[PDB]
Structures are given as C-alpha cells and as structure tokens.
C-alpha cells in the first residue's frame, strides 16, 4: 500500500523501549484516511519497521 514510506536498512539508537524483545526503528508513516460518500475507514493508516530479538 504505497501510502507507505519505503526502506528497511539503517542504524538505530534507543529513545524509549517497552518490549525487551523488539527494536522498532520508527513509526515510518501515518495518515488518517477519511474515505468518501461510498464508505468510511476514517482510521489512521500507518507503517512501521522493527527488528525483533534473537
């Protein structure tokens, strides 16, 4: 869904953390898609890339 920013290769420094098993790189993008008279989503489409642990 080329709503999305691209990429999947970088070098990461931690700001905050909650899962000791997950290193999320960043919320790569997010756009609230409203829809039209034919129907809704209204939600916030988004994209994330994350290197796990192991």
């Amino acid at each position: 869904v080329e709503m999305l920013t691209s990429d999947a290769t970088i070098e990461e420094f931690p700001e905050a953390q909650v899962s000791p098993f997950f290193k999320n790189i960043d919320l790569q993008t997010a756009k609230q898609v409203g829809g039209a008279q034919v129907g809704v989503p209204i939600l916030v489409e988004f994209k994330i890339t994350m290197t796990s642990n192991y």
Partner: protein, 57 residues
C-alpha cells in the same frame, strides 16, 4: 519465541527419492565398470543423477 531459536535443518540427503517416481520416467545416462563392481547411472524426470548397482532398487 520459535524464530529466536534460529534453527534450520538443511537438505542434502536422498528424498527417499526414486521410490517416489515411476520407472519408465527414469533415463539411463551412463554406466561405470571396474574392480569396485559395475554400477549404472540414471536420470530422474526432475533431472537429478543417481548411481545404482546389482542387488539395489
């Protein structure tokens, strides 16, 4: 929890292969003969080579 145990068990063996394919599909490539007894060489419909000899299947 199953990927983080990064585990692979590679393929290199026989699949037990030719006993899963029909005999008229197999093609004789070559034959070797010497002191180690005569051995035939045969080709799969999947294009693998095999080596088989008297008493084998």
């Amino acid at each position: 929890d199953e990927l983080g145990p990064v585990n692979a068990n590679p393929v290199a063996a026989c699949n037990e292969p030719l006993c899963s394919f029909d005999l008229d599909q197999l093609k004789l490539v070559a034959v070797v003969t010497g002191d180690a007894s005569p051995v035939a060489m045969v080709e799969d419909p999947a294009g693998r080579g095999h080596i088989v000899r008297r008493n084998t299947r």
